[PDB]
Structures are given as C-alpha cells and as structure tokens.
Design a binder for these strands. Structure first.
Ligand code: 62B
Ligand code: K
Ligand code: K
Ligand code: MG
Ligand code: MG
Ligand code: MG
Ligand code: MG
Ligand code: MG
Ligand code: MG
Ligand code: MG
Ligand code: MG
Ligand code: MG
Ligand code: MG
Ligand code: MG
Ligand code: MG
Ligand code: MG
Ligand code: MG
Ligand code: MG
Ligand code: MG
Ligand code: MG
Ligand code: MG
Ligand code: MG
Ligand code: MG
Ligand code: MG
Ligand code: NA
Lengths: 38, 177, 99, 204, 35, 121
RNA sequence: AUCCACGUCUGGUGGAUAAGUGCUGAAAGCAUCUAAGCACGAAGCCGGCCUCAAGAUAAGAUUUCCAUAGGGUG
RNA sequence: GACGGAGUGGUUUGGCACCUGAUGUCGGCUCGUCACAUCCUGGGGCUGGAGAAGGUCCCAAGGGUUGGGCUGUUCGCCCAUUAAAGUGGCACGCGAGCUGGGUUCAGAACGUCGUGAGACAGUUCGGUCUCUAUCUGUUGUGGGCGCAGGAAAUUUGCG
RNA sequence: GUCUCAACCGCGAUCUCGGUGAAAUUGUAGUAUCGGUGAAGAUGCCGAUUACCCGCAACGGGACGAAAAGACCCCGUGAA
RNA sequence: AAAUAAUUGCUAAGUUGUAAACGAAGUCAAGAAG
C-alpha cells in the first residue's frame, strides 16, 4: 500500500472504491498497485 | 434496480411467510429468517416473491437489489444447499473429522481442533498420494462463508509454491523464487 | 434577580432522541488539573450513568452563569421511567409541545 | 476472604530441600464474625470480623450494643472481607486453618513512620553538584521546580519533601511456609510492612 | 512439541445473535474436557 | 563487586599479570560483576617475553572476589583478592594452568577452569 | 537496639477500536470489506492491579448508643 | 528519480524595528513536562520477500532509551557496550535552584596595525555570581463550621 | 566519599514555649486555572473550568520579583 | 432583547452556524454530441 494525494488506476484491472469516506485502489491480481487517500 | 425487480421462483416443497418485518423461508434443509426494511415491500403471490419500491431514491435503489438477493440466497439454501471444497496442499498436511469435530495438521507445532455448528456439516475425503479434501455444506451462504475463510486463515496459500489451504481449483497468485 | 420559575419534573427521559451521528460523535472535553490531563467523553457515556447526568449538563449552559443559576438548577428532577414520588406536591401536567 | 493477624517478628529457617529461608511470624488469631452484610440491605456482601479481646472499660456503649447483638465477646479491631465460601453467620469463629489450603497470601499493613523527609530520601533525588568543586549549600537540594514564563507555574504532582511512611501498603504473593493451628501461628516467606505488634490483614 | 493444542468452537452472542469464535491453547490431553 | 576501572590479578599462565576492567557485559546499566561473570579488559602489565602484549583488549571471566558471595545453603565465601582468567574469541581460555583457588560458581559456567584448578572453594 | 544498602523478599495482571484482513451484498445485470447487516484485528483506549477518595454542599449506606451517649483540658 | 510546479511549519540564517528610572547571556548539573516528524519494544500492506537477513510505507507516544578518552564546549571523532543509545518545544525550559571552564571590565605579554595615545576575521596567564518568600504556585499537616437531633464504629466509590 | 551512590553519628543553627524585638519592600485589592485577545509573552479583558472559612511547616515556576534614573549601543554643536 | 414566523429549493459533511497544485466526481439543475 502507498498513500498519495492523487490516486489513479495505473493498470486496466484496478478499481477505485470508497471505504468509510476514503478512496482506495484495489487490485487482487497484482497487489503492488494498491493505493490509499484518493 | 435490474437485480431487485426479478421474481424468485419458489421451488417444490418450501413455504415462505412474512411476519413482523421478518421474511422466513422453510424447507428440507431448515428455516432461515431475514429482516426486511419497511420501505421495501414483498408480497407472496402464486408461489412467487415480488419486490417493489415507491421512491426511486438511492437509499431504496440499493436496498431493492439487496433484499432480492438475500431471499434468493435463502430459497436455494433450504432446497439444494451450498457446496465448498477445501484442498490442503503441501506434504505433511492432513485433515480428518470425527463427528462434527475437525482435526487439522497444517505445519505448526500444535494441532488445530474446530467444532462446527449443525448448520455446517463436515466431511473429509483424504486419499493416499492425493491431497486431503474438506467439504462443508449448509443452508446459509453468509455463515458457511464465515467458516470457510476461518479455516483458510490458518494457512493462506503462498506464491512461491501452491502450498496452503485453497478452494478447489482456485486461481492462485504464483511467483518464482 | 429572584427565583420565580417553576419546579420541573421530566419523565421518560431515557427515550430522548439525538439526531445525526451525535451519540458517539460529539466529543466533550475536560481537564483534571494535572499535566497531560485532558479527557474525552460522549453523550452516550453520560447516558450510561443515567438520564439525570445528560440532562443536567445540557440544561446547564442554557442558564445564567451566576449564583442564581446555580440555585435554580436544583429545581429540576429527571427520571428514567414513568415512576416518581412527588404526589404530595401535586405536580401539574403540561404538554411541552404547547410551549 | 481472609483474617486479621498480628506481626510478631522475623527469623530464618532451613527447608527440607535444604534452603535458608527468611520467614515472618504472624499470629492470625481467632476472629469472630461480628456483622453479616448482605445485598438487599447494605448494597454489597461482606463479613466483618473482630480480632483482639477488649476489656469493657475500653468499649464504648455503642460498640457494646454492637457485640451484644452478635452475642460475642467484645473485640478491639474490626475489618471487612468479601467473597467467602461457606455462608458463615453471626457469632461464628474462624481460625488459622482457613489458610491450611493456601499456597500464597497477600498481606496489607501500615508502614513504619519516617516523619517529614527530604527529596533525597523520599524520592531518591540525585542532589545538586558534587560535594566539592564550588558547591556552596545545595548538596541535598531539589534543583529546579519548573520552566520559565510559559507554564509560569509549578505543575500538580511535582515531587517535593513531605511526610513519608505511616501509610497502607500491600505485598502480594507471599509463599506460605507452615500453618500451626496450636498457637494460631502462620509462617510466610519474606517481609511484611509495619513494626512488631502491628495489625495485619491476610488475604487468602 | 506435543505440549499443547489449539481448540475452537463458535457460540451465539446475545449482543448480536451470530456466532463468535472462542479460542485457547490447552495441553494435548485436555481438549475432550473443552469440547 | 567489580566495575569499570577496577584492576584484577590475572590468575592463569597466559602471560598477562594485571588487567583493567573496561566493561561489564550483559545489560545497559549493569554495574557490578561477580564470580562467573564475563568482562572486557585491557592488559596492563605482562611477564617479559610473553605471548599477549601490554595494552591488548580481551575478554575474561572472574574467579575470585573480595566481596563475599552468597550461596543458597546459607554459606558465604570471600577471597583475599579479585582475580580473573583471560578467554579467547571462541570462548575458551588462553592458558594452561590456573594459580590459586577458584569459586564453585564456575561449576555451572566453565568446566575447563574447575578441572585444572588447585582447589575449588 | 534503631536507621540503612552493598542485603533480602515481592511486583509490572474482558470490552471497544487504529492501520489492516474478511463474509454476505446492491446502487451500477458484472465487480465491490459497506451502502442494510456480520466476524476479526495493537506494549495503544476503557476495565482489571495499588493508594487516596462523601466539603461527591448532589455532603451517600449500614450496626449500635443517647435524646450520663460521647467528648475536651490534664 | 532529472527539468520544472503547489503547499505546510516557524526549531536555522536573514528581513522589519512593534514591547522592554536593567526582560542575567554559552556549556554543564538538578528537576522535569509536552509533541510525534518513532531509536527499541507492539500490529500491518508491498517488495526486484525462497528461508535467514533486509528495503519501503502505514498504525502506534505505554514504558524504555549506557559508561568513558579529547575539547569550555554545543557539535563531532574515537573506545567498550545495548533491545535501543530518537528528534524537537517549553525566554535556543530551568543562575530570588547550583557552577563559573567560555564570552565581555580594570594587570601583563606575543603576532599584527598605528608617528602616538591605543587597537584586533587574533592569541595567551590572572581576575568578588547579592536578597530573612508578601501574593500566587506546589508538596505535606492542622483549626472552624457544615452535612435538617447528637454520638462510637464499619463502609460504597463520584473521581 | 571527588565519584559509582550514598548511609549513619555529634554539637551549633532549625522547630515549639517564655522574655525583648528590627529591616529591605509597599497605588488600592475579596490577588484561582486554561486557551483566546491585546503596546504583539494576562491574577485583574472574553468564553469556559475549578474552588467551604482560617492557619503552620517546606520548595522556589510566576508576580517581565527587590536592589542601582543600563557601564553595552546611539544621541548632546555635554565633560574629563 | 425580538419569529422554534410563512413559502421554495440545496447540504449529510456537524460541512456550517467565525488554503493551493492535484484527485475522485458524492449529489442537484440546465444543456451538447452520438
Ligand atoms: C546589562 C544587561 C543585562 C544584564 C545583560 C544583557 O547582556 C548585555 O547587555 C551584553 S553586552 C555587555 C553588558 C555589560 C557590559 N559591561 C559589557 C557588555 O559586553 C542581555 C544578555 C541582553 C543582550 C540585553 C537584555 C538583557 C535582559 C535580557 C538579557 O538576556 C540581557 C539586559 C537588560 C540585562 O539586564
Ligand atoms: K500560566
Ligand atoms: K466571531
Ligand atoms: Mg516514626
Ligand atoms: Mg552524591
Ligand atoms: Mg563558591
Ligand atoms: Mg557548604
Ligand atoms: Mg454482487
Ligand atoms: Mg517563535
Ligand atoms: Mg521598572
Ligand atoms: Mg505517526
Ligand atoms: Mg535557555
Ligand atoms: Mg544568581
Ligand atoms: Mg530564574
Ligand atoms: Mg590592559
Ligand atoms: Mg591564583
Ligand atoms: Mg551564591
Ligand atoms: Mg542542638
Ligand atoms: Mg519567641
Ligand atoms: Mg497570551
Ligand atoms: Mg492567563
Ligand atoms: Mg526587577
Ligand atoms: Mg537612564
Ligand atoms: Mg428572549
Ligand atoms: Na610600530
């Protein structure tokens, strides 16, 4: 997981979800693209 | 919703009711009760379950599909059931149940003993030269999913070899060393 | 400058309603007087002690901050259930919605 | 649960394994139940015990009516213990055999009184400077008591000189060496607070 | 080794109603007591 | 009761004669070292034509102390001096003979000292 | 004897959570730990341990005595 | 992570000159208290993570966080340890609490500048640290009255 | 015993009682805390918070505490 | 001190009642291409 002020997809299989007021980028196939704080 | 505007064809030999905001499905595998929110209404007609909502607001658009699926999961739960197969991978890993007691040797120093509720029956077909297989059945998707991931949590599969507790034929993240 | 109000009895106070995310979202702050002595608590923390500990704190702060206000807060009696013992005083009934 | 005792003194004994052990001798004398406290009347359940025989000349009339009700000989010391098992009633008698099944005990006492003491002995302060090297008169001084204009005050809880000792102290998990029912004697390993002849509470 | 073993059973909870998870580590010759 | 800057007799035939304690091992503010403890020393003096040199840094183990040592059976032992024995990097001793008595505490630490000492306690 | 350490003995003991992990699951036919619900999850928070503590002027409770009870001075 | 860009803070060096018939100054000692931008210990995500050992980021301030040689030193270098030898604020915390080695009085000397009296991006030896605590603050310990008659004990625990 | 790292002992001072009895200082005071505000670092302003009335011992954070019309610095068509 | 006044919408953040480059677009109104 990395924390950025601007989170993007960066990969075609990434999806942006909101979990308790915060944005996350999730990717089960390749977890190295996980992000937080959209 | 597209999902929540779908009838559920009530199968043979199961009875459905509605009393005090609670929807209750009874069948061969047991009975399941699910509270339904007063702003999403259901009526049992012709042996079919129809849902409808008054206002098109997002607080009901989310609830409409949600309550169609919770009932649709209950009806198939009390008629057929639900299947999950766990396959222990890695030498020295054995599974064997006596009654409802489950015994697991997953590589630690200690052993693991788990008692399941009567909702989740347990069976274990473990052949020689072949990996042990854990089979769980129930009528509740949510609870059987709760038990299945607790067993897998004891030993999650690793990438370097396929070793660990996996769902049967599950796609596994692999990574050479 | 005189105590001219009415003695008030509140009943069914355990069914008071707070809106929003206020029960465990409204932070109170107080200090013990020792260094590093600030503490937090919520309206639900008061409710555990009892209705008379939330109502007294809320009604205080809407009263004058003087000696007279300290006296008149003692003219308030708050009860959880519907049962009290003041039948010797002959309490009158008032619809608070009429105020 | 527990009983009242009197501190006698210390000695050292050899065990069967062949170890030298410091032991404290306590007279856990007979205690009578002087009052039973219950939920429905008092708000909690406990037992009040009385330990040392008292002359009538030393017992006030309010306390005389207290023991006469319980129908026991008046006592000098009174204490409460909770969480018993056996439902003793008024006027029952308890003794050292209560601890005959006890492996460890807690002892509550009052420490020896040191009077008014300085920061060096009360709190272990280091002292200011050396004994030489320009020292004038702050050998046993506390040093600074705070910061400058911000704060601009001494904080609560600052460690200073004052009264030391003569206070309730608890020592936990004392190993029981032997129980002597003949003399109402109990033997424990280690030391307990207080001077000889002081009154102790021993918790099972 | 062979000085303890892990035991789990699930009990319904009054606060919610769904099953919780009870866990300990008891010596190998004590699980029959627990279950 | 040995601490930093203490001087000990060297009680083996390692060549060294007097040693100065630099550190008591095994803890942030460990103040004192007793019999059977490990310390770090500097060699202060040597016999002419010896193996180790004056000013070398070495590990050592204490075998005698002037401060009395307590035993669980109620007995005590003290000696006329403080003495140690130099050890090598692999934990063994650098000499052949031990001169003088050694304490019984080393029966639980180093059997090499006890086997080749004139007397134990 | 007392006072001491360099001595001796003793001590540092369920709930709700953070970052995270999930189950079921729509809005949005799929996906999704969340939107309705639910199971976890830190030496941290609250309890649990020790001491003080009803001037807690909201001044609490119990047992008994007096209306010779009980005290002060010595 | 180059070329570039947007902010936050006010612990550095500055800019301004707004408070001051006197607002004691470096370093150390003593005594602390607070923050978290975490050194150790606790919990996690990712890894170019086989294991072991790491790297990086996230949550976390409960406790802990060494002794020496040199130097007035802060800071640094070195020696030996430790789980670790954190970073800062509080008048660069703290001199009506200590010291007085340094800086910054009057003596003297060197280099250097000046015709000289003298002077210093310098250096060197020496050179008085005052006050009986009123208010508040803090640590202990009492007297009076109250607590809806007066007393002797035992107590619950708001905190 | 300079220190690790302090411990104990004796007299004088100290504390209590009897006798005698000053001084520095002092606009008036029933003189609490926190943050804010402000001639820009608040006992005294604002909003909250805490606090029954009156002493004694002990320590020095604040009252930009006291003492001295700053010696530094600049200024005076000052002085030596 | 004086309206728990009347009517119509927006906000779910206690935002409010007294900061930016850059993200995601949470939601409401009016359009454009297709
Ligand atoms: C005399 C004034 C002092 C004691 C000290 C003063 O130091 C100086 O004057 C350094 S110059 C020095 C003076 C003596 C001369 N003979 C030689 C010359 O070298 C200092 C540090 C400040 C720079 C000014 C303000 C101050 C209060 C706060 C403070 O820290 C003080 C004043 C008001 C203070 O009363
Ligand atoms: K202040
Ligand atoms: K304003
Ligand atoms: Mg005494
Ligand atoms: Mg000292
Ligand atoms: Mg001096
Ligand atoms: Mg002196
Ligand atoms: Mg779905
Ligand atoms: Mg500043
Ligand atoms: Mg002035
Ligand atoms: Mg942090
Ligand atoms: Mg300073
Ligand atoms: Mg001074
Ligand atoms: Mg000062
Ligand atoms: Mg000169
Ligand atoms: Mg001289
Ligand atoms: Mg002085
Ligand atoms: Mg004397
Ligand atoms: Mg006198
Ligand atoms: Mg201010
Ligand atoms: Mg202020
Ligand atoms: Mg002054
Ligand atoms: Mg002037
Ligand atoms: Mg009004
Ligand atoms: Na010249």
């Amino acid at each position: 997981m990395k924390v950025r002020a601007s989170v993007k997809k960066r990969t075609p299989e990434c999806k942006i979800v909101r979990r308790k007021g915060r944005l996350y980028v999730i990717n089960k196939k390749n977890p190295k693209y996980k992000q937080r704080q959209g | 919703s597209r999902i929540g505007k779908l009838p559920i064809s009530i199968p043979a030999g199961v009875t459905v009711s509605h009393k005090d905001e609670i929807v209750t499905v009874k069948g061969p595998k047991g009975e399941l009760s699910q509270y339904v929110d007063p702003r999403i209404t259901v009526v049992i007609e012709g042996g079919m379950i129809h849902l409808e909502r008054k206002t098109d607001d997002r607080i009901e658009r989310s609830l409409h599909g949600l309550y169609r699926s919770l009932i649709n999961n209950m009806v198939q739960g009390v008629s057929a059931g639900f299947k999950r197969e766990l396959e222990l991978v890695g030498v020295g890993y054995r599974a064997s149940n006596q009654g409802q007691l489950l015994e697991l040797s997953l590589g630690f120093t200690h052993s693991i003993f788990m008692q399941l509720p009567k909702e989740v029956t347990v069976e274990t077909k473990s052949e020689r030269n072949k990996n042990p297989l854990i089979i769980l059945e129930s009528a509740d998707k949510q609870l059987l999913g709760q038990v299945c991931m607790k067993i897998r949590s004891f030993r999650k599969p690793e990438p370097y070899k396929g070793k660990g507790v996996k769902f049967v034929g599950e796609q596994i993240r692999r990574k050479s060393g | 400058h005189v105590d001219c109000g009415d003695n008030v009895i509140v009943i069914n106070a355990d069914k008071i309603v707070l809106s929003g995310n206020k029960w465990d979202g409204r932070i109170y702050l107080r200090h013990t007087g020792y260094p590093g002595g600030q503490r937090q608590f919520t309206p639900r923390d008061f409710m555990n002690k009892g209705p008379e500990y939330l109502f007294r704190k809320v009604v205080k702060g809407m009263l004058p901050k003087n000696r007279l206000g300290a006296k008149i807060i003692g003219n308030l009696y708050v009860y959880a259930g519907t049962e009290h013992k003041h039948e010797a005083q002959q309490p009158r009934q008032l619809d608070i919605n009429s105020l | 649960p527990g009983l009242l005792g009197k501190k006698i003194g210390m000695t050292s004994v050899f065990s069967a394994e062949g170890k030298n052990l410091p032991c404290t001798v306590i007279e856990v004398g007979p205690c009578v139940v002087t009052q039973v406290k219950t939920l429905e009347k008092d708000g909690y359940s406990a037992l009040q015990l009385g330990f040392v025989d008292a002359k009538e000349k030393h017992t006030t009339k309010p306390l005389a009516g207290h023991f006469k009700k319980a129908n026991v000989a008046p006592k000098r010391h009174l204490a409460e213990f909770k969480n018993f098992e056996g439902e003793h009633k008024l006027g029952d008698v308890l003794n050292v055999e209560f601890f005959s099944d006890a492996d460890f005990v807690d002892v509550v006492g009052t420490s020896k009184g040191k009077g008014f003491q300085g920061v060096v002995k009360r709190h272990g302060f280091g002292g200011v400077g050396q004994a030489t090297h320009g020292q004038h008169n702050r050998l046993r001084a506390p040093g600074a008591v705070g910061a400058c204009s911000y704060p601009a005050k001494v904080f609560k809880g600052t460690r200073m000189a004052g009264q030391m000792g003569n206070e309730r102290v608890t020592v936990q998990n004392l190993e029981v060496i032997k129980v002597m029912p003949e003399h109402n004697l109990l033997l424990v390993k280690g030391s307990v607070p207080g001077a000889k002849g002081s009154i102790l509470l021993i918790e099972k | 080794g062979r000085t303890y073993s892990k035991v789990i059973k699930m009990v319904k909870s009054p606060k919610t109603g769904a099953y919780t998870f009870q866990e300990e580590m008891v010596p190998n010759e004590a699980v029959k007591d627990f279950f | 009761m040995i601490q930093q800057e203490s001087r000990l007799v060297v009680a083996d035939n390692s060549g060294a004669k007097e040693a100065l304690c630099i550190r008591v091992l095994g803890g942030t503010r460990r103040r004192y070292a007793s019999v059977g403890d490990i310390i770090v020393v500097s060699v202060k003096s040597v016999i002419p034509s010896s193996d180790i040199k004056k000013g070398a840094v070495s590990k050592a183990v204490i075998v005698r102390t002037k401060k009395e040592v307590r035993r669980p059976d109620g007995s005590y032992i003290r000696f006329d001096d403080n003495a140690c024995v130099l050890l090598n990097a692999a934990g063994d001793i650098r000499g052949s003979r031990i001169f003088g008595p050694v304490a019984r505490e080393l029966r639980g630490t180093n059997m090499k000292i006890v086997s080749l000492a004139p007397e134990v306690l």
